[PDB]
Ligand binder design. Structure first.
Ligand SMILES: NCCc1cccnc1
Ligand SMILES: [Ca+2]
Ligand SMILES: [Ca+2]
Ligand SMILES: [Ca+2]
Ligand SMILES: [Ca+2]
Ligand SMILES: [Zn+2]
Length: 316
């Protein structure tokens, strides 16, 4: 909407206070005009119609329990925008400052969040499996990264290309979590998953098998569930990315780590220059090798480490 840019204050899902960019016109709206063509957050009001209503607040203070998922969806979309702009010189998900839209309070007890091709959508969780999913910065950034993928490589959401799609979202979700530097880790969703259980998460990149996901191509899922295992076989690529960044020995193969920043540069370049809608795991390895060659040189440690990491997970 048309109005003037303002700064509100609120509390997120985890009870932390933060400032949020709003717009004043009669009401204060969750519309951040400081980033691209705007970040807009909507109330789905427990329904499944989307987007719902642009979030309106009478006083620019967002401390009600009902406000918390909206505060975090809005704020973490801003952090994710900042990561892509400041780290990769990418302006929003399309590279042209497309407006970023999110809806919260989607459905009732909905234990998921997603990018729907047009916008991000967050359930509130059922209070046992999840609390409202926008409380996880890695979740928010995972979702917005699907939009980046859609506009770049276009990886089809099935089988190996879909597992790459998922892993790219986990990788950049994690790199955004490190960028914000609040309790960063290599696990996915820990801040919103199972409030009654400490120390768990949906997935681990450092040890995918902790939650039943494969960490070697020989253990890949070959069935039809989950669009051919897109959230399962992602563990093979997540493990490779973890090894590239942090190093380690895995099934007897040693990888010299090169750090998170170079991991991000290599995978961002692979995603935006080399991957295609039908890329498989072997093609991802080649894309990563070529990206590291472009950035660091063919004889570099970085190229050598990409090769050892894919070797370690059984991808040639
Ligand atoms: N992401 C968990 C995949 C899975 C499910 C059930 C048993 N083993 C593995
Ligand atoms: Ca208020
Ligand atoms: Ca964390
Ligand atoms: Ca995490
Ligand atoms: Ca938990
Ligand atoms: Zn995903």
């Amino acid at each position: 909407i048309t109005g003037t840019s303002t700064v509100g204050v609120g509390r997120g899902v985890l009870g932390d206070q933060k400032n949020i960019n709003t717009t004043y016109s009669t009401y204060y709206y969750l519309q951040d005009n400081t980033r691209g063509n705007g970040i807009f957050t909507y109330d789905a009001k427990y329904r499944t119609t989307l987007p719902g209503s642009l979030w309106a607040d009478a006083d620019n203070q967002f401390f009600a329990s009902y406000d918390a998922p909206a505060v975090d969806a809005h704020y973490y979309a801003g952090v994710t925008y900042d990561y892509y702009k400041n780290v990769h010189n990418r302006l929003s998900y399309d590279g042209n400052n497309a407006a970023i839209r999110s809806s919260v309070h989607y459905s009732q007890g909905y234990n998921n969040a997603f990018w729907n091709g047009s916008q991000m959508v967050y359930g509130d969780g059922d209070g046992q499996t999840f609390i409202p999913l926008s409380g996880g910065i890695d979740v928010v950034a995972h979702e917005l990264t699907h939009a980046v993928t859609d506009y770049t490589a276009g990886l089809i959401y099935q089988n190996e290309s879909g597992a790459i799609n998922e892993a790219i979202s986990d990788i950049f979700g994690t790199l955004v979590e490190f960028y914000a530097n609040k309790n960063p880790d290599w696990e996915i969703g820990e801040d919103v998953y199972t409030p009654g259980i400490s120390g768990d998460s949906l997935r681990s990149m450092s040890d995918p098998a902790k939650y039943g996901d494969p960490d070697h191509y020989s253990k890949r899922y070959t069935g039809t569930q989950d669009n051919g295992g897109v959230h399962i076989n992602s563990g093979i690529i997540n493990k490779a990315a973890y090894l590239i960044s942090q190093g380690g020995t895995h099934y007897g193969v040693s990888v010299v780590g090169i750090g998170r920043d170079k991991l991000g540069k290599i995978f961002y370049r692979a995603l935006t220059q080399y991957l295609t809608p039908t890329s498989n795991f072997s093609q991802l390895r080649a894309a990563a090798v070529q990206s590291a060659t472009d950035l660091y040189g063919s004889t570099s440690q970085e190229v050598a480490s990409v090769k050892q990491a894919f070797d370690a997970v059984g991808v040639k």
